[PDB]
């Protein structure tokens, strides 16, 4: 392929570098349209700038914790992180959430990959090894109230017991209820003055839930489970404009009152190089 | 049973892995993809559009105006603006070319930089743009500028003049993040002659500026971008 052909002097009626930009058409002008050049080469096709990349790396998307201790006397288990859960989504963590909000609707299969490590931050006489079990509670699914409910049978619920200090790589097909995922959804569940506006509505794939299958050793152990996700088999439609002002909550495009500028100021002059 | 030997790197969780992995939801069949206008394939298709550079930062806050490169009526030989080309910073740091190109570490190609006047139909002007490749500095006045790639432009019906910054570098790639070996250079714009104004009209007029990337643009090595942050996890 070629970089730019050779170009000699000129003089015409045909003025390439003079257009009317109020039409909306960003003119495909060129170097070799404005000067004397030479034939060169390309040897580049940006494999690294293809959307099945600049969207599809393994990045974290969310991090909670739990703990295995003696439940004997707990009113509510959750309140004890005896076991936990996740309203699956992506907005939790801004680094990836910025890449995705780069286009309007997106579509793909994913590589939800889990990993988890433990702490005995207090007079432990050995680091125990547990096994974490992570469930997937589809919206409409019964829910784990305790670290040893029946819910934790997972008869028809896709679960994976893996080990601490280790990881698990369970990949899932795209499960949009529609031809692709809505990123911004200027809508409401219904024509009712009093409902919530935002995509918060369009997006349940429900939750996730992790507990620790062992009966409390004697000392206390805390586990911090991390969830990593890699989009793959992507398509994206309608780019938009990238976020400038920071984030404030999942599924809202808000920004904080009283915020430091985003436009870097110009010390001195505009004339200033 | 078939004999194996495990190599160093077992169980390493490299995040950049294209590996084969099982379906948590087997036999499950998706929602039939339909059609949607506008569809991206490669970042590089969208950064070939233009956006406006706020070449006029000089504010207390962010401003619709930090975008308006003003023009001063009946002056001459004077400077209109300037800056350098660290498209991974300054003015540029907040455009679609920035914010994206920001996402990568290495770049190359030739920027196309546009410039549109909005002065009363019946006013004229003839100024000059000009790229000053790397070696000296901000031209600091016409003459010195003019001996660099530059382009006189006569204002008429065609509001926009499209100047193109020829990729002119030794090495064949440049650190997106600012660095001097891998420096880009500069560019200005001076009153060729001056800005005239029709009778019964008054003040200043303006130039809008945009910058888009070229056919030839190049970007590799994916880095993370600075431009965003969260001290903490967000909430429902």
């Amino acid at each position: 392929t070629v970089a730019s052909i050779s170009s000699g002097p000129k003089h015409t009626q045909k003025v390439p570098i003079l257009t009317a930009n109020e039409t909306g058409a960003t003119m495909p002008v060129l170097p070799s349209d404005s000067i004397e050049t030479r034939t060169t080469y390309m040897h580049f096709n940006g494999s690294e700038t293809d959307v099945e990349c600049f969207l599809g790396r393994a990045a974290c998307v969310h991090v909670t914790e739990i703990q295995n201790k003696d439940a004997t006397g707990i009113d509510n288990h959750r309140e004890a992180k005896l076991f936990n859960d996740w309203k699956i989504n992506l907005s939790s963590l801004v680094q990836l959430r910025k890449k995705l909000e780069l286009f309007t609707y997106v579509r793909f299969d994913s590589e939800y990959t889990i990993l988890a490590t433990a702490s005995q931050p207090d007079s432990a006489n050995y680091s125990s090894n547990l096994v974490v079990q992570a469930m997937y509670v589809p919206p409409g699914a019964p829910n784990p109230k305790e670290w040893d409910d029946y819910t934790w049978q997972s008869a028809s619920n896709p679960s994976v017991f893996f080990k601490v200090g280790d990881t698990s790589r369970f990949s899932v097909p795209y499960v949009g209820l529609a031809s692709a995922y809505n990123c911004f959804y200027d809508g409401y569940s219904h024509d009712d003055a009093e409902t919530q506006y935002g995509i918060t509505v369009l997006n349940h794939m429900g939750s996730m839930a992790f507990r620790i299958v062992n009966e409390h050793d004697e000392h206390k152990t805390l586990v911090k489970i991390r969830v990593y996700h890699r989009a793959k088999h992507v398509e994206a439609w309608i780019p938009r404009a990238p976020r400038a002002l920071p984030y404030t909550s999942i599924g809202r495009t808000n920004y904080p009152k009283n915020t430091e500028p985003v436009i870097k100021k110009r010390k001195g002059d505009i004339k200033s190089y | 049973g078939l004999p194996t030997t495990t190599l160093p790197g077992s169980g390493q969780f490299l995040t950049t892995d294209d590996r084969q992995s099982p379906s948590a939801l087997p036999n499950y069949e998706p929602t039939p993809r339909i059609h949607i206008p506008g569809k991206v394939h490669n970042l590089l298709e969208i950064i070939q559009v233009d956006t406006l550079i706020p070449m006029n930062n000089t504010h207390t806050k962010d401003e619709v105006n930090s975008y308006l490169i003003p023009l001063n009526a009946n002056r001459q030989n004077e400077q209109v603006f300037g800056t350098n080309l660290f498209i991974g910073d300054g003015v540029f740091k907040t455009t679609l070319l920035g914010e994206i190109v920001q996402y990568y570490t290495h770049w190359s190609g030739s920027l196309r930089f546009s410039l549109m006047y909005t002065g009363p139909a019946l006013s004229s002007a003839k100024l000059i743009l000009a790229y000053t490749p790397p070696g000296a500095r901000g031209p600091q006045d016409r003459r010195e500028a003019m001996l660099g790639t530059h382009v006189v432009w006569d204002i008429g019906l065609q509001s926009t003049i499209v100047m193109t910054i020829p990729w002119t570098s030794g090495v064949q790639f440049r650190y997106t993040d600012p660095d001097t070996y891998t420096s880009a250079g500069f560019l200005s714009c001076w009153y060729q002659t001056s800005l005239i104004l029709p009778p019964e009209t008054t003040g200043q007029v303006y130039l809008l500026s945009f910058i888009s990337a070229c056919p030839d643009f190049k970007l590799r090595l994916m880095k993370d971008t600075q431009t965003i942050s969260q001290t903490v996890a967000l909430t429902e």
Epitope: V63, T64, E65, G73, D75, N76, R78, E79, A80, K81 | -
Partner: antibody, heavy 119, light 107 residues
Framework: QGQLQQSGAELVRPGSSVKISCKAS????????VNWVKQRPGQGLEWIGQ????????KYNGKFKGKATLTADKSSTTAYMQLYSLTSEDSAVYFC????????????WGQGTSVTVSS | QIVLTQSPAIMSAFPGEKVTITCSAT?????MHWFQQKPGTSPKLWIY???NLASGVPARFSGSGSGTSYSLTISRMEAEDAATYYC?????????FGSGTKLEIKR
């Protein structure tokens, strides 16, 4: 034993949003939660949310989805939360309390902050 | 969402008169936490976990039950009884307090 010292009597013009506080004193903030209850005048011991400093783990009662936005600061060991779009329903009383020492519900309790919305 | 209900709404108790209150949640709450409030004070932990006399909560007191409906006792009311009572559910999640058997004094 600890303390849930609270913010001070609040007068907010309607439509605003204020932040009352709380601060733990002599127990490890970063371990137990802080619930908040909106016991209005001649009104019940209402439950806004509950937040956990420890990692930011939390939950809210569906009345206050929007209104209440619980929050903890790990150094000044000061819980908070602030109400948005104030209305004279928010004219009630907010209390914070330490939860889960476990034999007991929110055992340790704070005094409160008065929130009154009007011009 | 287990909807709580303090048994009487309020009465009055001549000191000596033994006092018994009750909570009747809809569903099953396993642990009844009883809070009390002599106004001008923060509500305070009387009986935790169905039947335990919290700290400093005197002996006349006590209570129990389960599943649904639990209760409270004060072998005979006093002065320091004419307060308000809150049973309190912690089992179901939008953690929800009682109603209010406003304890009443008789003279």
């Amino acid at each position: 034993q600890g303390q849930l010292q609270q913010s001070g009597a609040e007068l907010v013009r309607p439509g605003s949003s204020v932040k009352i506080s709380c601060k733990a004193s002599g127990y490890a903030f970063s371990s137990f939660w802080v619930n908040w209850v909106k016991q209005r005048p001649g009104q019940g011991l209402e439950w806004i949310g509950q937040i956990y400093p420890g990692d930011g783990d939390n939950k809210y009662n569906g009345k206050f989805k929007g209104k209440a936005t619980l929050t903890a600061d790990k150094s000044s060991t000061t819980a908070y939360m602030q109400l948005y779009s104030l209305t004279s329903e928010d004219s009630a009383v907010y209390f914070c309390a330490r939860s889960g020492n476990y034999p007991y519900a929110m055992d340790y309790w704070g005094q409160g902050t008065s929130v009154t919305v009007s011009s | 969402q287990i909807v709580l209900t303090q048994s009487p709404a309020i009465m009055s108790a001549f000191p000596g008169e033994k006092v018994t209150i009750t909570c009747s949640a809809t569903s099953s709450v396993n642990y009844m936490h009883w809070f009390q409030q002599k106004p001008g004070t923060s509500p305070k932990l009387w009986i935790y976990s169905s039947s335990n006399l919290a700290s400093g909560v005197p002996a006349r007191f006590s209570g129990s039950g389960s599943g649904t409906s639990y209760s409270l006792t004060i072998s005979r009311m006093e002065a320091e009884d004419a307060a308000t009572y809150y049973c309190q559910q912690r089992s179901s999640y939008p953690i929800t307090f009682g109603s209010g058997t406003k304890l009443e004094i008789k003279r």
